[PDB]
Design a binder for these strands. Structure first.
Lengths: 213, 708
RNA sequence: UUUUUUUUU
């Protein structure tokens, strides 16, 4: 047991050899998987965070631990689905916080961390905007996504614009033309908008502007 | 003693001379011939229904054979009313209540016996568990007794001549199960001792020649929609792609009706399911094909998920024929009627058991099916409506390439148990013993060797108290010996639980698309150095008050666990506990606070599974088995994340590689202590990786003894 | 990365 303790202290001083020492010693096992934690990977950090969330009476402790886990896993991320799940989960923590009445401000903070992250991130902005509109402040969030796209005033950001202009409709005309400065389906769609508003002749003009291209 | 009606309306006939007319005259009566009850309208309707069954039209003839022959064979179409009507015919000819005897009908399944007991109980207008019953609902008034072959085998083990029965019926003898064959072999001698016994052999399909020739030229009674057969002109290079493409083809072109596809394993089946689902959806979307519903079907599924195949075909909004595709193993190959199935797709492959006498081990291998099996698979259709069967092989292959009829299980399976049971029957010279089909002497000798090391058979060849005790249990001899020796390590309850958990299919649920959360949920119950210990934790958590306060089934559906497997395990554990209490085995356990807890459990495990031990290659990759010296690896579903160089395993499985399933770390010292007979250095081959450090452990032991 | 079958209210 003492030599195993030396194997443990050596593990603290530290790969698999410590685990072999653990087998030589063979709650300590869960402690050992925890040691593996002490050493897709970030996704595993998320899945374990999910099972821990299932295990979450100090749920707040497991959640804050998930936050510090975000602080550690962020180093591993040097991003899309990692950052995306990271945002969806953080906002989910502020969502369970919202259920706890514990949340939108901290959600704005984690979303600010998403701003600190460095198109899936645009999905994150789309998410903060999504709950933000689900929150009962529709225009206020649109002003923010607009703050981002205006911040882009690049070409890659335009796919996010199609991600944004698609719901920015619910005036929008110039917002749409900004795309023309920088996709036929998009064109026919927009002309269909004006047709729905029955601008008619203006709509025909759009087809003039498409075909010159 | 059996309670019965004294009768009197039965008198007027010489024994064994009952005609059909008299029986029918008793049937149409307002009063029951065997009980004092009056007949219900339900009985009238059911009688009207069953009187039109094909087996009834031959009743007279059946009687005329059964009266003049001691042993007879019976073959009829599927669902003609064999299992239900034949024993009643027997009841009408015999005098079971007058001569104070029972009549036994044997089913190879529990559910079979139970269900048919229900149906027949409703047919004879008796309450289930009274005069007609299954075993157990059998009381002292029970005349018609449905039972598994194992139960009849037990009653045969307690009473050699089976004096309680005057007529014994074995249905579905085409499966040739262990208990069935043993029972036939016994009955062949019982008929020599007592001529008052009659034996009936029933099956829907059979190679009746073997049965007739075995029972000394026994008589055979054979009682009488088109299914079209399609063969491929050429050979199909990849049977899987051929299967998928052909199923999609039947979906796109052929007439209305459901499709039944046979495949190999659950992995292959899942792959085929998701592929056929995807391309099927694409077919509906782009080529305007009808809606398609694919359902998987294999043994490891819960009974509900198995029942899911009988769901109606998908509704159609577009007008295109919506249909259902049932992807199954050979579980639906024999005796099963699905209403919607019209088409049957057969690649001609299955997974069968292969045994190597040199290694003395059994594994599973993909093999070509048999002619009989093909006729069965093709016979699944053409019941509700005319069927069409697409076989993915040439007719020339059917005539030549395909085996005549599936090799018997006894000639394949490890006996290791068969020998023990034969010895319990009282057979001394098994080599000289009269089988219908004698097994391989190599396998026999190795089995006797295993039982010799397990101390079930002494050096002389007779049964030890350990063998005589372990024979009564429904377990594999190793599991048995382990369970018996358990209470000496003061942990018999835990070992009992572990055995029960090993006797049930895989508990853990692992979704294809959600592996992480399932693996975490398993890691919660996971225990270092032991899969068995982990299983014990799982059952101990399932039987916990907390899990009952949550929602048990909900709790199982929250921790990624199979409720069916867990409840089945609880049941098995109850049975084994009852048996332990019957043969007087102490239920003993130790505190978790005691550090010798896990060690006791491990030791008790080694007591029965010392022959199945693996050692990791010193300074290399992979493991190697002590027995027969085979290179092996640890199964991916094993908890042990660290390299324990000495392990005890439960299952040997062949798939992508030679894998070892369900393990637990052990000390070689314990192994030497428990089974010195098998672990003497003299037994094993020259200097190999195992022996080299085993001898080091020996040097260690001898130094320990030297210092004292 | 790979559970064919079965194992008494």
């Amino acid at each position: 047991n003492q030599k195993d303790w030396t194997e443990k202290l050596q593990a603290h001083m530290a790969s698999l050899i410590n685990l072999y020492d653990i087998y030589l010693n063979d709650d300590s096992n869960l402690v050992e998987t925890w040691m593996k934690r002490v050493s897709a990977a970030e996704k595993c950090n998320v899945y374990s965070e999910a099972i821990l969330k299932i295990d979450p009476k100090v749920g707040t402790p497991g959640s804050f631990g998930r936050l510090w886990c975000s602080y550690g896993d962020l180093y591993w991320r040097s991003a899309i689905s990692t950052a995306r799940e990271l945002w969806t989960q953080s906002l989910k923590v502020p969502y369970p916080y919202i259920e706890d009445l514990e949340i939108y401000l901290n959600w704005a903070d984690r979303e600010l961390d998403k701003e600190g992250v460095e198109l899936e991130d645009a999905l994150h902005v789309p998410t903060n905007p999504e709950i933000l509109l689900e929150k009962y402040n529709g225009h206020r969030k649109i002003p923010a996504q607009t703050v981002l796209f205006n911040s882009l005033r690049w070409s890659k950001y335009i796919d996010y614009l199609e991600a944004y202009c698609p719901k920015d409709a619910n005036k929008t005309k110039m917002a749409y033309n900004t795309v023309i400065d920088l996709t036929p389906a998009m064109a026919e769609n927009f002309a269909l908008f004006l047709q729905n508003h029955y601008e008619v002749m203006e709509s025909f003009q759009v087809y003039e502007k498409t075909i010159p291209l | 003693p059996l309670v019965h009606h004294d009768a009197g309306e039965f008198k007027g006939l010489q024994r064994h001379h009952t005609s059909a007319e008299e029986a029918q005259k008793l049937e149409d009566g307002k009063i029951n011939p065997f009980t004092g009850r009056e007949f219900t309208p339900k009985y009238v309707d059911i009688l009207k229904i069953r009187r039109e069954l094909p087996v009834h039209a031959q009743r007279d003839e059946f009687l005329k054979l059964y009266q003049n022959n001691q042993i007879m064979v019976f073959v009829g179409e599927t669902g003609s009313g064999k299992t239900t009507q034949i024993p009643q015919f027997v009841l009408f000819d015999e005098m079971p209540h007058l001569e104070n005897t029972q009549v036994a009908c044997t089913q190879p399944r529990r559910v079979a016996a139970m269900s048919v007991a229900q149906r027949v109980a409703e047919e004879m207008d008796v309450k289930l568990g009274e005069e007609v019953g299954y075993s157990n609902k059998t009381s002292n008034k029970t005349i018609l007794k449905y039972m598994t072959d194992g139960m009849l085998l037990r009653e045969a083990m307690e009473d050699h001549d089976l004096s309680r029965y005057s007529c014994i019926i074995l249905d579905e003898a085409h499966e040739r199960t262990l208990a069935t064959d043993i029972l036939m072999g016994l009955l062949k001698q019982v008929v020599k001792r007592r001529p008052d016994l009659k034996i009936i052999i029933m099956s829907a399909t059979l190679d009746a020649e073997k049965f007739q020739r075995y029972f000394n030229d026994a008589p055979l009674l054979a009682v009488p929609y088109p299914v079209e057969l399609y063969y491929t002109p050429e050979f199909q290079r990849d049977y899987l792609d051929s299967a998928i493409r052909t199923v999609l083809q039947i979906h796109a072109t052929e007439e209305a009706g459901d499709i039944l596809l046979f495949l190999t394993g659950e992995d292959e089946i899942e792959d085929a399911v998701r592929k056929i689902s995807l391309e099927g959806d694409q077919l509906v979307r782009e080529e305007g094909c009808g809606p398609l519903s694919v359902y998987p079907l294999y043994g490891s599924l819960p009974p509900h998920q198995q029942q899911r195949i009988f769901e109606p075909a998908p509704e159609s909004h577009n007008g295109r024929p919506g249909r259902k595709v049932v992807i199954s193993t050979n579980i639906a190959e024999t005796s099963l009627t699905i209403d919607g199935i019209v088409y049957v797709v057969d690649p001609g492959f299955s997974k069968q058991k292969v045994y190597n006498p040199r290694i003395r081990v059994e594994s599973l291998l993909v093999s070509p099916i048999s002619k009989a099996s093909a006729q069965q698979r093709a016979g699944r259709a053409g019941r509700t409506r005319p069927g069409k069967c697409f076989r993915l092989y040439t007719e020339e292959a059917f005539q030549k390439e395909l085996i005549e009829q599936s090799y018997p299980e006894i000639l394949r399976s490890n006996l290791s148990s068969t020998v023990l049971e034969l010895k319990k029957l009282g057979i001394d010279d098994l080599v000289h013993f009269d089988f219908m089909d004698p097994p391989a002497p190599e396998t026999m000798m190795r089995a006797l060797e295993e039982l010799n090391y397990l101390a079930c058979l002494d050096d002389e060849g007779n049964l030890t108290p350990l063998g005589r005790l372990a024979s009564q249990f429904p377990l594999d001899p190793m599991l048995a010996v382990m369970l018996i020796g358990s209470f000496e390590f003061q942990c018999s309850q835990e070992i009992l639980t572990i055995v029960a958990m090993l006797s049930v299919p895989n508990v853990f649920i692992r979704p294809t698309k959600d592996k992480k959360r399932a693996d975490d949920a398993k890691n919660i119950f996971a225990h270092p150095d032991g899969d068995h210990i982990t299983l014990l934790n799982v059952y101990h958590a399932f039987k916990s008050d907390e899990a009952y306060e949550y929602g048990i089934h909900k709790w199982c559906r929250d921790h990624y666990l199979n409720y069916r497997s867990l409840s089945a395990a609880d049941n098995i554990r109850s049975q084994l506990e009852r048996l332990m209490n019957r043969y007087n085995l102490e239920l003993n356990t130790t505190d978790y606070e005691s550090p010798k807890y896990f060690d006791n459990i491990r030791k008790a495990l080694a007591s029965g599974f010392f022959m199945q031990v693996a050692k990791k290659r010193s300074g290399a990759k992979g493991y190697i088995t002590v027995k027969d010296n085979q290179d092996v690896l640890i199964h991916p579903s094993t908890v042990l994340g660290h390299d324990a160089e000495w392990v005890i395993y439960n299952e040997f499985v062949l798939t992508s590689k030679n894998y070892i399933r369900t393990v637990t770390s052990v000390r070689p010292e314990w192994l030497i202590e428990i089974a010195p007979a098998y672990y003497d250095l003299s037994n094993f081959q020259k200097g190999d990786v195992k022996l080299s450090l085993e001898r080091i452990k020996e040097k260690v032991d001898r130094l320990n003894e030297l210092k004292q």
